[PDB]
Amino acid sequence: TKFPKFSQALAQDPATRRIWYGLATAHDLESHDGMTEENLYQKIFASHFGHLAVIFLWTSGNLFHVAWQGNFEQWVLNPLKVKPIAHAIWDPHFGQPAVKAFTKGGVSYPVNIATSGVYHWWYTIGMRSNTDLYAGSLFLLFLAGVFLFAGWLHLQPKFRPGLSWFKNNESRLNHHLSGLFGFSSLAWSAHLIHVAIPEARGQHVCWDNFTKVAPHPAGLQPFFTGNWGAYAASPDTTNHIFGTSEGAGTAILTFLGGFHPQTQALWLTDIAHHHLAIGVVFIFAGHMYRTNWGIGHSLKEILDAHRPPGGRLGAGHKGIFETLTNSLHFQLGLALASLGVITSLVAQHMYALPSYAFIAKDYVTQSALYTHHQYIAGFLMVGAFAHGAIFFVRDYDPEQNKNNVLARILDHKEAIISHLSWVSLFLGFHTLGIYVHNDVVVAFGTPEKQILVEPVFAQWIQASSGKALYGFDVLLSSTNSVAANASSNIWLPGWLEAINSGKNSLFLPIGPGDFLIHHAIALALHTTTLILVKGALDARGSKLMPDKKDFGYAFPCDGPGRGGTCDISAWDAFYLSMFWMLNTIGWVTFYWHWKHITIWQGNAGQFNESSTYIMGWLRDYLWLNSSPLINGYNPFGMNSLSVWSWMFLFGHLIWATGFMFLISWRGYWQELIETLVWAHERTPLANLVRWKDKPVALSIVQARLVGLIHFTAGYIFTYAAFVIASTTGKFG
Amino acid sequence: ETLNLQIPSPTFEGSTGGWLRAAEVEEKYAITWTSPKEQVFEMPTGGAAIMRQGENLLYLARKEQCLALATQVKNSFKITDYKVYRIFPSGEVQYLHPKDGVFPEKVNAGRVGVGNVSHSIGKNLNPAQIKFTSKSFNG
Amino acid sequence: LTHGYFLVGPFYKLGPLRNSDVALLSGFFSALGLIVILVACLTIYGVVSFE
Amino acid sequence: DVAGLTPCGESKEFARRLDGSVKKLQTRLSKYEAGTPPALALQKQIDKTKNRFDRYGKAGLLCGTDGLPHLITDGRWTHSGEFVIPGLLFLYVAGWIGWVGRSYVLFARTADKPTEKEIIIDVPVALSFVSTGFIWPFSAFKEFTSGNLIVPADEITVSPR
Amino acid sequence: MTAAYLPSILVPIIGLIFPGLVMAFAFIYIEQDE
Amino acid sequence: FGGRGLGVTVNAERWNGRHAMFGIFAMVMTSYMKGHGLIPDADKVLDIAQWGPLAAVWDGAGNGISNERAIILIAHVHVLVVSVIAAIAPFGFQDTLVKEKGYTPESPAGLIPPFKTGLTAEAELINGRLAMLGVISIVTASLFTGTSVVDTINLGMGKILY
Amino acid sequence: WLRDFLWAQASQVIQSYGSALSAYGLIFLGAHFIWAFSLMFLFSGRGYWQELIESIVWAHNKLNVAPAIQPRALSITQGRAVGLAHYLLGGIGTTWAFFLARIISVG
Ligand code: CLA
Ligand code: CLA
Ligand code: CLA
Ligand code: CLA
Ligand code: CLA
Ligand SMILES: CC1=CCCC(C)(C)[C@H]1/C=C/C(C)=C/C=C/C(C)=C/C=C/C=C(C)/C=C/C=C(C)/C=C/C1=C(C)CCCC1(C)C
Ligand SMILES: CC1=CCCC(C)(C)[C@H]1/C=C/C(C)=C/C=C/C(C)=C/C=C/C=C(C)/C=C/C=C(C)/C=C/C1=C(C)CCCC1(C)C
Ligand SMILES: CC1=C(C/C=C(\C)CCC[C@H](C)CCC[C@H](C)CCCC(C)C)C(=O)c2ccccc2C1=O
């Protein structure tokens, strides 16, 4: 009767709904009883420090478990042959065949083999021994403690920040651009130049010697003379064996481009020069805003003055400053949309341009990292649109936003939504129709009749960056071009070697199957956007429910009247778009993984011929690659893919269990539960035990969430088991 | 006015759909009505019972259970003589329906309007306006 | 006395260590562990249910 | 040629596609006697397969490394018969259907009971309308400019937001 | 492995005692009224 | 929770005192016990074939718990079952771990309880505070100096145990 | 059941293309499609589709091509019935195609 102490409406509920709803509304601090704005921003600040610490404890845990139980020192000796160990297994349910089957990695105990790539990342950035992985784990435990104490400290009465501090947009932007983005990128260049570059070249540099070991033989004298090009002189040779002194140069900043020939990763001197460039740029960008000394920009002044004189945007951005600052949901939506695009950039640029030594030969790690970050990307992008819907319901004031960009977006909400409906339908009808055309014609024994459309626009883009496969002779592909001549002395020789060589995932060859799947991804991104945009724009009202704002973000329905109002809330369009997010990241990761496993065999033509129809995707990707995974255990034994073999079935179960919450709805279950309440009260020896909370069926919104969680968890666990076990079992 | 606890009840052979421990520990509802006949009706909680000629008394676990029987008795047997009471475990009897002797669908003097909003529904305040202030969204 | 007496048998006969010579000791310990979990359940029910 | 593709008439992979596709049917024909109805049917299938590959070879289509025809749809006029010209034929028929249906819903609004005209179609009038579609680009553009296609924003029901 | 005893000591504690105890306490806290 | 004698209370101080005096006894007793080799087959590694996967340890040699460690654990399990039975079903006279919600918390002892030479509560609390501190002293001494806890117990008492 | 029954015996439907059993491969894929398409009607509710139809009705009103029989999202019961009908058709058609290509090839 007092668990949701933040909610008296839930704390007086006599049912089991109180526990569920108190657990599910716990982090929605804005909705808590008697919540002021001061207390809202100060609890968010302290709980952001708790998230900071959880991240640091998670990273310290990965470092500790690899330092303790991993084979990092064995792996760094021979990184292409040794399989990295994540942590050991102590499971009292194992049989002795299971214990023997997981005893890989060169150790004497069962282990999980790491798919996270942390070995390649820690190898590349300098770590050599278990002592420094452990030292990193210790330092992160200290930092986690520092940020937990900071979270407690900024909850103390003298140390409580005011709302004037929390909304100082200019000082926060100045410091996050110049200190958090820029100076830490500059400090990361210092780590590469001072530690990672020398230790990639055999010379150990630690805290014990880094003030008496110069990164460059000349040493901070060329920098303080303008002779900066002396830091690019004598780069690492193509004969360099990573981690050793043979083939090593003395340069610490280069723009060679392409990849280190042995590790098949970006040059660490390119990465050090990248973070130096991006650091200075971000530091300069962090001097943009006026704080205390009269130079800089006021964000209010910039936003108010950007109204085009033609009047096409109305009042423009007048009043957008206040809306953004006052609305934490508008900020969360901008932050999550921005972050979601970046983790999609992270997934796309880390497989094509890997930075870590001897990764991109760890095919399981490449598949897991790409799949992981694309799923994180889809979650962040859907959440951005969710919090835009929450912004419109909760924080958007139409009077304060008269004729703005925001009001005028709502004014044409139907033009936006109907054109997203058109483009979704357009793409879906044709992409599916071309795929079905191809399936029917191939089935009828006539593969030639297939509508195979070359991806010429993308091929032109590849050629424009120097791919010579398509013979476009555009820009970099043409030897005598202004673009080619300009970059010839700096990054083009390495880039042309990297792009033209077929040993890397840089600008991988694209054909008709690639075109069709890209259009499928376009239908998926447009359809998820349609559902999310329809939810955000119709969040505050619709013809079916004009006063939808008055009911909130997440409500079940408005009842069976007016024809029926199931899934009418903006939350329910989040709910419906979550399936479309899962479907699109499914199409993306299925495409990435199938194209890569076919290239990794040396059989890229198998994707080229089978991806243009859907039975090729069914038999040649899902059915063909299932066999190492589903044979992880059988009546003839088991091997170390048994865990993924069990997880794959576990994902199928959770996913299907989600269907129970999504297909079967409340009234059936409340009528079951009332017969169980009768039976418990009428059973002798059992009616001595009484519930404190009346058993009720799950709510309409709660069951939609429970089915969505089960569907999503089943989706993730099934695909993670498949993408890891098929790649591990195949090794290619 | 008060519930006469001695009113005889309709002939029901019992059912499992009746009231549970919350009726004897939280609240119970009773419905009384006068019938001109010895006639069979359907229980809200199950099968069929026979209402006796004269005055009948029922014990249900919900007010909707009472009002469901009230509608069945008014549409099929034309009884308009139904009084719905909420009986606390303390023994307090609370008269409920019709609350002032006249049905809610008929106007009655001395009824004060509760929940009435002076404007139409499209003039409700936006949630941003009522955020971080105690002011209500109905204007 | 009733419940503890019959709990030992399923753990002993059908447990992981059933084929071992320590099957009865494992079954008793498993029964005892289940008794401790159940007695914790009885304790927590008593704390919350009854004023 | 275009996009590193080869014309289908000189690609060896298209030729081995045709040869394999004819061998599959010839081994099905090898189990039947000459004048029998299955053999006659199979031979006509072989003739159709050869005609398809012969026509595709001389059509200017470009084959891939897989020996299947690929469509170039970037707008170039040497390949306009694969998307730009079939697309113009589509847009003419699609705009025909759209103009004809729009004309019929505007007719049906001016009826005594408008909704019976949409479940029981006035077939002579609807056939008058299906004949109207052959000059839909001009009819629809004159409709657009004469203020009869687009209704103003203040004549359309919208949600309160 | 060094400290090989710790997985045998902690994994049953973290995996059985920790949930049991925190579930028991969570149950007491959610059910309690004052 | 706190209103039942749990937390930083004198009831908890007394109970942890009792457990630390018993623990100092048990540490001294196991030091004497394995110094003379009176634990049978102390080095013998238990086989997973008899005991199952709970016996696995992952120490590079043997891959199993030793018999000594299992025997000390079984001694602890004996007194844990006594502990649970005493916690849930105490004696009529015994002090109870969880005091009734409405109880009178005993006054805090202070810096030093009054000295009574008999079997008194004050003597129990003094010895208990000393033993809890003693547990910390031995655990830190062994940790700091890189010696087995059994060995530092033996060293403190002048090797009387062994 | 996953490996030795569904995966092992679905070999014939997946590899049926270019043969006389290619219709079963097409119905196998088509029924997987119909089954999945059913879940659009099963996991969603009418109110989403009516507000989406409102935006589409706006686009029709803008071109003066609104129908006189006002488009509605299907009823709540009909959304359930359409989802169940497509689910049964998709599942049974998947099993129908799988069973028939498997046993025509091997039996
Ligand atoms: C230089 C000064 C400075 C610095 C360093 C910070 C730093 C920070 N502040 Mg800020 N802050 C400052 C001044 C500063 N503050 C001032 C002056 C004010 C008052 C006006 C504030 C007011 C303020 C508020 C109100 C809040 C913060 C918060 C935060 C934290 C952000 C959370 C996080 O982890 O992001 C870390 C972000 C990065 C490391 C950069 C992101 C990198 C981008 C996204 C992509 C780069 C990818 C790159 C390859 C990384 C690869 C990693 C590796 C695995 C490959 C962060 C620690 C928030 C917080 O969490 O509270 C603790 C918060 O709520 N600050
Ligand atoms: C295979 C599964 C599947 C398929 C095909 C679809 C298809 C579609 N969904 Mg649905 N959806 C699904 C699963 C599926 N969904 C699931 C599981 C969920 C989670 C609940 C959703 C949730 C969802 C939402 C919330 C939304 C969609 C939307 C869409 C549309 C997006 C593509 C588009 O706009 O045009 C593509 C059109 C097609 C693919 C239709 C196929 C064309 C047909 C088959 C022609 C065949 C004619 C033939 C003769 C019929 C024979 C019948 C016989 C009895 C005579 C389309 C109708 C969005 C929408 O309506 O945007 C406009 C939208 O808002 N879907
Ligand atoms: C011929 C009549 C007609 C016309 C002119 C339009 C016009 C339009 N519709 Mg379509 N629509 C129609 C019928 C029609 N609709 C019907 C019957 C349905 C139910 C299936 C829909 C469902 C529909 C959806 C779901 C969407 C549109 C959209 C659109 C707009 C974009 C154009 C487009 O891509 O069409 C697309 C057309 C379809 C997807 C369905 C085509 C339906 C058939 C082919 C037409 C029916 C022929 C009709 C029976 C003719 C009978 C007349 C005869 C008696 C003389 C535009 C306002 C889109 C929009 O709002 O974007 C701005 C959109 O998302 N419409
Ligand atoms: C947060 C990251 C994290 C994660 C997921 C794990 C995961 C695991 N650890 Mg732990 N561990 C971590 C960090 C982490 N470790 C750190 C930083 C240390 C250094 C002190 C250790 C030291 C450690 C030891 C010594 C042992 C494990 C063991 C294990 C395994 C069994 C669980 C167990 O007995 O835990 C016991 C873990 C601890 C007592 C240390 C606490 C772990 C972190 C710091 C807690 C952080 C919690 C998280 C941030 C948020 C909690 C709330 C959450 C429920 C929402 C399991 C693989 C056992 C093992 O390897 O068996 C194979 C084992 O014996 N861990
Ligand atoms: C995540 C951690 C975890 C761990 C470490 C264990 C540990 C164990 N499980 Mg597993 N189990 C778990 C989770 C876990 N379980 C979950 C989540 C489930 C549900 C899916 C199961 C379901 C399960 C089954 C169905 C069985 C086991 C069995 C076993 C035992 C291994 C077999 C053996 O050697 O028998 C020797 C085992 C013993 C001698 C039993 C020792 C009894 C302990 C020591 C008493 C502990 C007292 C108790 C925890 C008090 C807690 C009170 C509460 C407040 C915490 C071992 C005790 C088997 C078993 O019970 O063994 C008989 C068995 O049949 N487990
Ligand atoms: C989700 C969550 C909830 C609320 C909000 C939140 C706070 C922000 C967030 C954070 C959660 C977080 C950050 C949770 C963090 C949880 C953590 C860090 C748990 C760590 C546990 C470590 C243990 C139990 C080790 C004990 C070691 C011992 C006893 C060794 C002792 C010893 C040995 C043998 C050797 C030395 C001597 C002695 C002393 C004898
Ligand atoms: C719903 C909602 C309600 C209101 C609040 C809200 C939260 C804000 C909102 C959410 C909105 C959301 C969730 C919005 C999400 C918005 C997103 C994801 C926008 C993506 C923008 C990407 C751009 C502009 C890429 C540009 C690349 C370029 C120009 C590359 C150029 C090039 C370069 C340099 C290199 C290559 C060559 C070329 C190609 C020339
Ligand atoms: C897509 C969808 C709609 C919209 C679907 C509509 C409006 C159906 C319209 C489809 C076109 C207009 C006709 C369908 C014709 C098909 C090509 C074949 C139909 C075969 C029989 C109808 C004869 C709902 O109304 C709905 C309601 C409740 C739960 C889920 C949903 C749901 O998922």
Per-residue H/E/C for C21-36: CCHHHHHHHHHHHHHH
Q: Nearest residue CA, atom 16 of ligand 2?
A: G40
Q: What pairing do the DSSP bridges indicate for beta strands A633-634 and B48-51?
A: unpaired
Residue A208: CB atoms within 10 Å: 9
A206 is annotated as contributing to ligand binding: no
Residue G56 Cβ inside 6 Å of ligand 2? The answer reads no
Q: Does E8 touch chain F (CB under 8 A)?
A: yes
Burial tier of D70 (Cβ tally within 10 Å: 0-12, 13-18, 19+): buried
Tokens of A567: 């899934």
**Crossing angle between the packed helical segments E18-31 and C23-49, to the nearest 10 degrees:** 20
The residue assigned the tokens 């626009």 is: A457
The H or E element that residue A456 is part of is: helix A456-464
* CA proximity to B59, closest of B98, B27, B104, B37: B27
Give residues preceding each break in chain B, C–N over 2.5 A.
Answer: none
Task: Count Cβ neighbours within 10 Å for each residue of F128-157 and write b for 16 or more, e otherwise.
Answer: bbebbebbeebeebbeeeeeebbbbbbebe
Rounded to whole angstroms, the maximal C-alpha distance in chain B is 62
Burial tier of A74 (Cβ tally within 10 Å: 0-12, 13-18, 19+): middle
Task: Give which of E31, E32, E34 to mutate to test A binding, by max A Cβ within 10 Å.
Answer: E31
Residues of A in contact with F54 (CB under 8 A): 92
Using the 8-state DSSP alphabet, how is residue A70 labeled? Answer: S
Interchain CB distance below 8 Å, G62 and D106 = no
Which atom of ligand 6 is the closest one to the Cα of A53? 13
Chain F window 56-95: which residues touch E at a Cβ cutoff of 8 Å? 56-60, 65, 69
Give the residue numbers of the binding site of G for chlorophyll a': 32
Using the mean position of ligand 8's atoms as its centre, give its distance from the Cα of residue A561 in Å.
20
Q: Which amino acid is at A385?
A: F
Residue C10 Cβ inside 6 Å of ligand 5? The answer reads no
Distance CA A15, CA A504 (A): 59
| DSSP per-residue letters across chain G | -IIIIIIHHTHHHHT-TTSTTHHHHHHHHHHHHHHHHHHHHHH--HHHHHHHHHHHHHHHHHTT---SS---PPPHHHHHHHHHHHHHHHHHHHHHHHHHHHHHHH-
Residue G41: CB atoms within 10 Å: 20
Using the 8-state DSSP alphabet, how is residue A182 labeled? Answer: I
> Half-sphere exposure of residue G46, counting CA atoms within 13 Å on the CB side?
24
Distance CA F150, CA B113 (A): 83
| DSSP per-residue letters across A471-530 | ----GGGSSS-HHHHHHHTTTHHHHHHHHH-TTS-TT----HHHHHHHHHHHHHHHHHHH
Distance CA B49, CA B40 (A): 6
Strand partners, B83: B32
The H or E element that residue A169 is part of is: helix A169-175
Residue B109's contacts (CB-CB under 8 Å, 6 or more residues apart) are none
Burial tier of A521 (Cβ tally within 10 Å: 0-12, 13-18, 19+): middle
Residue A341 Cβ inside 6 Å of ligand 7? The answer reads yes
Using CA atoms of A193, A198, A200, A203 in order, give the dihedral in degrees to the nearest 10: -170
Residue F133's contacts (CB-CB under 8 Å, 6 or more residues apart) are none
Interchain CB distance below 8 Å, B137 and A395 = no
Interchain CB distance below 8 Å, A108 and F63 = yes
| Phi, psi for A692 (deg, rounded to 5) | -80, -30
The residue assigned the tokens 């004198």 is: F10
Interchain CB distance below 8 Å, C48 and E20 = no
Residue F80 Cβ inside 6 Å of ligand 6? The answer reads no
Give residues preceding each break in chain F, C–N over 2.5 A.
Answer: none
Nearest neighbour of A448 by CB, restricted to D53, D71, D161: D53
B98: cis peptide before it, omega within 30°? yes
* CA proximity to A414, closest of F136, B120, G60: G60
| DSSP per-residue letters across D74-129 | SS-GGGTTTTHHHHHHHHHHHHHHHHHHHHHHHHHHTSSSTTHHHHS--HHHHHHH
Burial tier of A386 (Cβ tally within 10 Å: 0-12, 13-18, 19+): buried
A349 is annotated as contributing to ligand binding: no
Distance CA B53, CA A570 (A): 55
> Half-sphere exposure of residue A124, counting CA atoms within 13 Å on the CB side?
23
| Phi, psi for A637 (deg, rounded to 5) | 145, -165
Using the 8-state DSSP alphabet, how is residue A225 labeled? Answer: G
Distance CA D52, CA D62 (A): 15
Tokens of G69: 């029989």
Distance CA A16, CA A692 (A): 9
Distance CA F75, CA F54 (A): 17
Distance CA A228, CA A192 (A): 17
Residue G88: CB atoms within 10 Å: 13
Residue from G49, G51, G55 whose mutation best tests the ligand 8 pocket (most atoms within 8 A of CB): G49
Contact (Cβ atoms closer than 8 angstroms) between residue A472 and residue A463 = yes
Q: Nearest residue CA, atom 31 of ligand 5?
A: A92
Three-point CA angle A446, A451, A454, nearest 5°? 130
> Half-sphere exposure of residue D92, counting CA atoms within 13 Å on the CB side?
8
Our CA-based measurement puts residue G19 at a distance from the nearest CA of chain A, in whole angstroms, of: 7
Using the mean position of ligand 2's atoms as its centre, give its distance from the Cα of residue G36 in Å.
9
Tokens of A676: 């169980």
The H or E element that residue D69 is part of is: strand D69-70
Task: Count Cβ neighbours within 10 Å for each residue of B11-38 and write b for 16 or more, e otherwise.
Answer: ebeeeebbbbeebeeebbbbbbbbbeee
The residue assigned the tokens 């979601």 is: A340
Give the residue numbers of the binding site of G for chlorophyll a: 32, 40, 48, 60, 78, 86-87, 95-96
Distance CA A307, CA A309 (A): 6
Interchain CB distance below 8 Å, A678 and B127 = no
Distance CA A292, CA A296 (A): 9
What is the experimental resolution, given in Å to one decimal place? Answer: 3.0
Chain A window 373-402: which residues touch B at a Cβ cutoff of 8 Å? 393-400
Rounded to whole angstroms, the maximal C-alpha distance in chain D is 77
- Lay out the sheet containing D69-70: strands in order across: D6-7, D62-63, D69-70
Our CA-based measurement puts residue G12 at a distance from the nearest CA of chain D, in whole angstroms, of: 19
The residue assigned the tokens 């109207």 is: D132
